[PDB]
Amino acid sequence: MKELIYIEEPSILFAHGQKCTDPRDGLALFGPLNQIYGIKSGVVGTQKGLQ
Amino acid sequence: MKELIYIEEPSILFAHGQKCTDPRDGLALFGPLNQIYGIKSGVVGTQKGLQ
């Protein structure tokens, strides 16, 4: 009669040195660890794809 | 005896469509045409270069 072994969910870090588990929830609450200044995007394709 | 003509200093465009003759003054009054989001600076050098 073997017994299964459970391991607790790992803790990942987030902004301001705080730890959460869900990435979406931690991002929506705290956000990324490193904050970029902002990036400009580029698109190649048809006018319909652009709009 | 012959005359010599003068050309006025041209005006370079700036923010909001305004223009000025001096680039530094036009920047200080209006600013650049395209406002970037900022850039991450990269430095290669000594720690004395760092400070």
Among A47, A12, A39, A37, smallest CA distance to A26 is for A12
Is-contact A20 A32, C-beta < 8 A? no
Q: Retrieve residue A19's tokens.
A: 């730890």
Give the side-chain half-sphere CA count within 13 A for A24.
Answer: 0
Is-contact B10 B21, C-beta < 8 A? yes
Q: Per the CB < 8 Å rule, is B38 touching A37?
A: yes
Q: Per the CB < 8 Å rule, is B40 touching A40?
A: no
Method for structure elucidation: cryo-EM
How far away is chain A from the Cα of B39, in angstroms, using its nearest Cα?
Answer: 6
How far away is chain B from the Cα of A37, in angstroms, using its nearest Cα?
Answer: 5
* Cα–Cα distance measured from residue A14 to residue A32, given in angstroms and rounded to the nearest whole number: 6
In angstroms, this model's resolution equals 3.4
Q: Dmax of chain B from CA atoms? A: 65
* Cα–Cα distance measured from residue B49 to residue B35, given in angstroms and rounded to the nearest whole number: 29
